[PDB]
Ligand SMILES: Cc1cc2nc3c(=O)[nH]c(=O)nc-3n(C[C@H](O)[C@H](O)[C@H](O)COP(=O)(O)O)c2cc1C
């Protein structure tokens with residue numbers, strides 16, 4: 427199998443979601459050694475913002491480049507089986523770095539199509555894992571719109587099989603930060619050894 | 621009073637939410653002529669993406685400029701009474717243009733502060749109006765995370781008094797597009813003449 431890892435934190439090597447993504451990779455390589463793993467860091471190698479000129483490209487030099495970057499990202503997504511998405515929460519949303527990727531991957535006739543019975547995703551047979559870190563504690567509450575957003579967006583393009591790994595309470599001190607890292611690594615181990 | 625209008629569509633003068641924002645302005649000037657109205661188009665005059673270097677600024681030349689742009693935006697927000705936010709839905713989220721504004725307005729000790737009983741907003745006494753356009757029909761359903769996100773983010777910074785104006789079904793043909801424009805202008809008239 428082929429595993430794609432999407433990093434989106436703006437905190438570099440201090441990132442909680444990056445360090446848990448690197449723990450998922452290390453665990454997958456030890457348990458599955460032949461599988462090919464691709465890491466794409468959307469903070470270190472940023473995707474442009476979807477503006478008026480790019481939504482026309484989906485042509486000028488810059489439209490052409492966005493179209494080809496789009497096509498690249500989509501072929502990469504479709505090439506992989508297991509899609510690991512690091513989704514830190516900033517200001518109640520996902521990171522802009524992740525959002526810009528989504529905005530180039532969502533393409534009519536490519537990653538979804540219109541049907542009589544509504545849009546249907548075209549990125550099929552994938553298993554996703556969301557690693558989502560938060561300062562506070564939102565899970566199953568009204569302030570977590572990241573979780574259902576992710577479900578909705580991934581579901582739209584075809585990715586219905588999504589498992590969530592939460593690391594909450596990071597801002598609450600060393601016992602709660604360690605709880606969040608221990609409970610997210612335990613969740614990660616259950617997925618890697620299922 | 622002072623009314624701030626935030627445009628965030630990437631569709632320019634073809635924008636549904638821009639044309640309803642311009643209808644709100646025209647209606648407010650005719651009904652309230654002395655009130656000062658400020659329009660800020662976040663697509664025509666973009667706000668940078670929050671990255672690692674900017675989240676440090678909140679210093680390098682570019683950190684200094686982001687800090688001053690932040691301070692500007694926040695003083696502008698706090699200067700106005702009535703905050704009109706055009707929030708088109710792209711890929712189940714708000715526009716990146718709007719998100720980048722939020723990411724520079726949300727500042728600890730400035731637009732919210734930490735308390736014993738949780739964060740509290742510091743932008744007080746405001747009345748917000750969200751004009752939110754969608755191709756499809758999401759209202760009160762599980763695919764509308766934009767509405768509760770907006771409530772949550774605005775509530776966080778202090779803006780608890782939010783009225784939503786929906787323009788849905790834009791993609792459904794001329795009768796449904798006209799329904800959406802007629803029902804959003806009627807909603808706008810009820811707010812302007814309350
Ligand atoms: C710009 C910014 C905004 C934040 N917003 C929120 C938030 O809305 N809710 C929350 O619970 N924590 C918030 N946090 C804290 C992050 O969610 C927490 O630090 C998380 O570990 C980030 O993952 P990361 O280290 O992989 O970037 C924010 C942090 C940053 C830097």
Ligand SMILES: Cc1cc2nc3c(=O)[nH]c(=O)nc-3n(C[C@H](O)[C@H](O)[C@H](O)COP(=O)(O)O)c2cc1C
Nearest residue numbers: 629631635636637708709710711712753754755756
């Ligand atoms: C990049 C892009 C993505 C879109 N995503 C969605 C969507 O997730 N859900 C929806 O119902 N409509 C969607 N639409 C349609 C817009 O919501 C609809 O055109 C709306 O009128 C946009 O407001 P605006 O004209 O002010 O930009 C999208 C349109 C664009 C351009």
